[PDB]
Every structure is written in structure tokens, then in C-alpha cells.
Ligand SMILES: CC(C)C[C@H](NC(=O)[C@@H](O)[C@H](N)Cc1ccccc1)C(=O)O
Ligand SMILES: [Yb+3]
């Protein structure tokens with residue numbers, strides 16, 4: 381019954397398992413390097429274990445020590461995106477359950493895909509550099525040697541030396557801070573992570589950080605210039621944490637801190653344990669983008685406690701999380717709001733399916749990533765097809781109350797483990813033993829393995845959506861004779877959430893006649909809106925509708941921030957617009973060196989450059 385992580389080159393969990401990592405390292409901003417030792421505590425699962433394989437990518441290995449003595453090792457040839465396999469020779473055969481500790485002397489490449497090294501110019505303050513990591517899905521290997529698979533969980537401790545003037549944070553509990561004693565001008569920062577986690581949750585940030593405390597278990601961290609606003613933006617965190625506890629059981633990580641990164645952070649959010657990372661694009665000034673917060677909080681259970689065993693089952697992480705996320709929001713804002721968000725997610729799903737094509741393998745809930753780079757397959761599918769499956773099951777089995785009971789039990793049952801779609805479904809049938817008959821009505825094959833839209837669409841309350849549809853349809857079907865009647869009053873009772881959904885709906889039918897788009901700016905002044913979601917969609921609509929004036933706006937948003945969600949499609953749209961094509965390409969080329977590494981690689985691909 382063997383399950384393979386086709387994304388890792390390391391020895392599998394059925395051979396050995398890393399149980400702990402002791403990391404001592406220093407951050408060299410001049411050399412743009414991370415240097416140090418990775419002491420891994422490994423546990424054999426086989427008798428006579430004489431050698432193991434670790435994952436690495438662009439890693440420079442100084443030495444490998446075991447029991448005070450250096451050991452034999454090798455680096456196989458690079459396997460493109462998977463990096464290069466590092467084989468280690470054990471001086472003693474190991475037997476089941478026996479453990480050795482391997483200390484690894486390493487240096488990272490300044491071109492590490494897990495990292496982004498920023499010049500002070502690139503920072504808010506302009507006087508200091510900044511460094512941030514991003515390991516999910518498989519970039520940990522780009523920072524240190526490891527079994528770079530979610531099927532393995534370990535605890536870890538780390539001490540990191542950084543320039544006295546800068547602050548270091550990790551996805552762990554801050555254990556203490558002390559001056560180094562080593563002919564340096566560095567500080568030594570300490571962290572402890574008592575809960576076993578998959579290595580993709582390992583995270584580091586170094587910079588001129590300041591923090592504000594916004595809850596008993598929460599401080600907001602960011603450069604000085606973002607602190608205050610962040611503090612305001614995320615005010616609701618603690619209340620979210622409380623809901624989540626009620627939904628999934630106790631929060632076991634201890635602290636729930638937030639880190640507002642610099643603009644090039646590639647994601648909206650990242651559930652790094654004890655230190656969720658978020659895009660500064662969330663700072664809308666009205667807390668309207670807090671769902672991202674609810675989301676990352678939710679991972680503290682679905683993802684971080686119960687983890688997908690391989691990236692092929694990624695939907696377990698994301699679909700359950702979106703489900704929880706939506707419940708948090710429904711709890712804080714209303715069931716009608718939950719439904720609204722759910723229906724909009726279905727919309728994102730329609731877009732993803734249209735984009736890849738309805739027969740595309742990446743549209744399946746359970747995928748096969750053999751030979752595929754996760755960064756490349758990444759989409760809304762696991763999020764939305766996953767969420768739709770859960771919503772549908774909730775409706776079929778009795779309701780939210782009933783389904784949340786299954787959810788809390790599932791979390792309990794699989795806490796600290798890495799599992800697959802089958803474990804989830806086998807549990808579902810077990811929990812719902814009284815309803816097997818209902819369960820059997822679901823078309824599992826289609827839902828789990830068929831491409832395209834789900835076999836069935838759940839039911840949704842239309843309360844908040846109706847105004848959106850009325851409005852988008854009016855614009856989509858408008859004639860010359862309707863233009864004059866549109867008016868700002870049209871937006872009178874629409875929340876920012878509804879404006880966004882209106883635009884999303886409109887966008888699905890782009891292009892609109894240029895004259896219409898112009899009228900739209902004239903009556904609603906969307907150019908003036910700073911909310912990122914709204915501007916993103918508005919600008920796409922504009923570009924796709926061929927409005928040349930929008931070119932500079934689109935270029936600006938695309939490069940001034942680097943959240944992939946916005947950056948990629950803006951660049952793509954601009955490249956598809958004959959009028960801005962050359963300039964889109966040129967801008968990228970000019971910006972590439974200063975961009976985040978994965979974003980950079982994806983945009984180039986998107987643009988077909990290189
Ligand atoms: C759906 C939203 C609430 C937020 C969303 N973020 C997430 O889903 C995070 O929890 C994900 N963990 C982001 C991620 C996925 C795959 C590889 C690297 C990073 C994002 O768009 O950044
Ligand atoms: Yb060297």
C-alpha cells in the first residue's frame with residue numbers, strides 16, 4: 381500500500397523519518413547567503429539502514445558529520461525543479477526505530493528559489509536590507525538538506541545570527557535574543573518549534589521589523605511604515621482565532637503572530653506556524669480583505685495539524701481550509717455572507733476550468749504531479765473544487781452543524797499526521813456510518829478524478845449576489861441607449877465585496893465595448909479604488925477591453941507589487957493586448973533581476989520569454 385511523493389528525491393517515510401532539526405545559521409546579506417549547520421535527527425524504519433537520501437537544490441555542502449566524525453556523501457545530478465539528491469553514508473547500519481543524528485555544513489545559493497534577498501532600496505525604509513523565505517511547496521530543499529516531503533513531520537530548534545540592527549523571526553516560538561560572540565556585528569536569535577511540522581512550513585524573515593500587539597497571542601510585524609496600518613487592518617484576528625477553536629478544537633501552536641511582508645511576497649498569505657506571512661496588498665484600510673487572515677488561521681488545523689501526505693492530495697489542505705475560512709466569515713458577518721463567498725468561489729472555479737480547459741488534468745481534484753512542477757500546476761482548483769465538494773456534502777448530510785462535527789472529529793483523528801484522500805474518505809464513511817446510504821449517492825469518481833466542473837453544483841443563497849448580477853448583466857447587455865442612465869447611484873448599496881463580485885462577473889464576459897468601459901470609469905471612478913482585488917479585476921477588464929489608457933496602470937500594479945495572483949494575469953493580459961505587448965515584455969525583462977525567484981520564473985514562462 382505504498383504512496384509516493386513524486387516531488388521529492390529523498391528517502392521516503394517508509395525508510396526513515398526525520399524527527400527533529402537543530403538549525404544554527406547566519407544570515408550574510410553581503411554575500412546573500414545563509415550559512416550553517418543542519419543537525420537532523422533521523423529515525424530508521426528499516427533494519428540495516430546504511431545510507432539515506434536527502435533533497436537539496438542549489439546547495440553548497442561543506443561537510444557531513446556524524447558522531448563527531450565526517451562521513452561519505454554524494455550529490456547526484458540535478459533533476460530540474462526537484463534540485464539534486466544528496467546521498468549520505470551511515471557509519472553504522474540502523475535498525476527499525478533507531479536514530480542517528482546527521483549534522484550538515486551548508487551554504488545556500490544567492491539564487492535560492494526559497495528566498496528573496498532585497499536591497500535596502502527595495503524596502504520601505506530604504507536603509508536596510510531584508511530577507512524572506514517561502515518553502516511551500518518544495519523549496520525547503522533550497523535552504524537546507526531534508527526529506528522535502530509533507531509526509532514527514534519534525535520538530536525543530538534554531539538559532540540564527542543576524543546583524544545587530546535587524547530582527548529575525550521564524551515559524552516558531554521566539555525563545556530568546558542574545559548578542560553573538562564571534563568577531564561579529566550580529567545578534568543571535570532563538571526559536572523553538574515543539575509541534576511536529578512538514579518542512580514546507582519552515583520559515584524565516586530578517587529585516588528592520590517592528591511589531592504591534594493586537595491580541596493576547598498576537599503581535600503584528602512589519603517595517604515601521606506598515607505597522608500602524610497593519611495593526612488596524614488585522615484587528616479581528618483574535619476573534620477569528622476564537623471561532624476557529626470552536627470549529628476545529630484547541631489552537632495548539634501557542635502564538636499566532638502576523639508578518640506583513642514587502643510587496644514582492646508572492647502569496648496573499650502563508651500559514652507558517654506561529655507566524656503567518658501576508659501580502660501588504662491586504663492593507664485595504666477597511667479590513668475587507670480579512671478573509672485571508674481567517675484562511676491562514678484555519679490552516680492551524682487543516683494543513684498544519686492534518687497535512688496532505690503528498691502534493692497530489694493538496695486539496696485536503698486547501699479545500700478544508702476554504703471551508704473553515706468561510707465558516708469563520710459566516711460567523712462574523714452572516715450566513716448570507718458565507719453563501720455569497722461560496723458562490724463567488726464557484727465563479728473562480730469556472731474561470732480556472734475555462735482557463736486550463738475542461739479536459740485538463742490539472743482540473744481534477746486529486747492530481748498526479750509526476751514530472752510536473754508544483755508552482756506550475758498551481759491553481760484555484762484544489763481550493764474551489766475542494767470547497768465545493770465539502771459544501772455539497774454538508775448539504776447532503778444534514779447541514780453545517782452536522783458537517784462541522786465530522787470536521788472537528790477528522791481533525792482530532794488525524795492530528796500530527798500526514799494523510800491521503802482515501803484516509804479522509806474512509807474516515808468520512810466511518811464517521812457517517814449511519815448515513816452510508818447517503819454517501820453512496822455521491823459520484824466519488826467524478827468528484828475526485830474527473831476533470832472539469834464538478835458533477836453537481838451545491839445550492840446557494842442569492843441574497844447578496846443578486847445586486848451583482850443585475851448590475852453586471854445590465855452592463856454586459858447595454859446598448860448605446862443605456863449608457864447615459866448608468867450612474868454612481870448604481871453603487872449605493874454595494875459593499876466592497878459586491879463591487880468586486882460585480883467586476884468578476886463582468887470580467888467573465890470580457891471584452892466589453894471600449895466605449896462601455898470608458899463610461900464605466902466615468903460613472904463609477906474605479907480608477908480611484910485602492911482595494912487590490914477590485915483594482916486587479918478592474919484593470920484586467922480595461923486591458924481586455926482594449927483601453928490603452930489602462931496600460932500604464934496595469935504595468936504599475938503588476939510591478940509595484942508581486943502577489944502572483946495579480947502579477948501573472950496582469951502581465952499576461954498586457955502581453956495579449958497588441959498595444960502593450962512589447963512594453964509588457966520589456967518591463968518584465970527590466971524587472972526580472974529584482975523580482976521574487978518563483979514569480980520571475982513563472983512570468984517568463986507566461987510571457988514565453990527565454
Ligand atoms: C485563498 C486565500 C485565503 C489565500 C491564498 N493563500 C493560501 O491558500 C495559503 O494558505 C497557501 N498555503 C499558499 C501556497 C500554496 C501553494 C504553494 C505555496 C503557497 C492566496 O491567494 O495567497
Ligand atoms: Yb566557500
Ligand SMILES: [Yb+3]
Nearest residue numbers: 411413415487
Ligand atoms: Yb561562501
Ligand SMILES: [Yb+3]
Nearest residue numbers: 859860861862
Ligand atoms: Yb435599448
Ligand SMILES: [Zn+2]
Nearest residue numbers: 675679698701
Ligand atoms: Zn491555504
